Amino acid sequence: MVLSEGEWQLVLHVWAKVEADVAGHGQDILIRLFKSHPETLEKFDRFKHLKTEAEMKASEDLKKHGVRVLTALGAILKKKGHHEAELKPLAQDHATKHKIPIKYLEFISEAIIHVLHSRHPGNFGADAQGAMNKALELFRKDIAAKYKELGYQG
Ligand code: HEM
Ligand SMILES: [C-]#N
């Protein structure tokens, strides 16, 4: 599938607002994922002991992790689909080290959309949410293809 330049600009205009405070956005997204789909938290050996949103918010390691996740996603989005080099290591790690199914990438996509919709109504109206959904769908389609190449059913 392929996004138009106008769709990419809607993605990158909301991402510019994430980048005012990537750490706070990462906390909100990870907490939303873990609350909405608690089974995902069991994939994190470092974090699966956290019992409450307050503990999650207070975890410095979780905050640093969210910064890495959103910075990797932002680098992918800034490639506007030309993200083969960035996806290779991400897909190998997520298939073979972490064992993250596509369904769980769908859950984090939903958490990203939920947090952006909540924080950024000025840059996340219906057209912008549709563009971000297309971008995340493209990311998941290309990860799924790489999973299959790597031998992981996902
Ligand atoms: C937008 C989708 C995602 C992106 C861009 C992403 C990106 C990353 C990155 C960059 C790291 C490495 C951080 C480091 O250098 O230490 C990481 C680690 C990890 N990811 Fe993801 N990830 C995504 C989705 C998920 C999901 C949905 C799960 C689980 C449900 C997951 C599970 C993990 C695990 C278990 C680690 C290792 C964490 C640790 O070192 O303690 N990822 N991810
Ligand atoms: C990956 N979190």
All structural domains of the chain, each given as residue ranges with its CATH number in brackets, are: 1-154 (1.10.490.10)
Pocket of ligand 1 from Cβ distances under 6 Å? 40, 43-44, 46, 65, 68-69, 72-73, 90, 94, 98, 100, 104-105, 108
Q: How far apart are CA 73 and CA 108, in angstroms?
A: 12
Residue 65 is labelled as binding a ligand: yes
Method: X-ray
Cβ neighbors of 72 (< 8 A, separation 6 or more) are 86, 90
- For residue 125, the CA-to-ligand 2 centroid distance in Å is 26
Angle between helices 22-36 and 102-119 (to 10 degrees): 120
Report the length, in residues, of the chain: 154
- Tell me which amino acid residue 90 is: L
Place of tokens 């607002």: 17
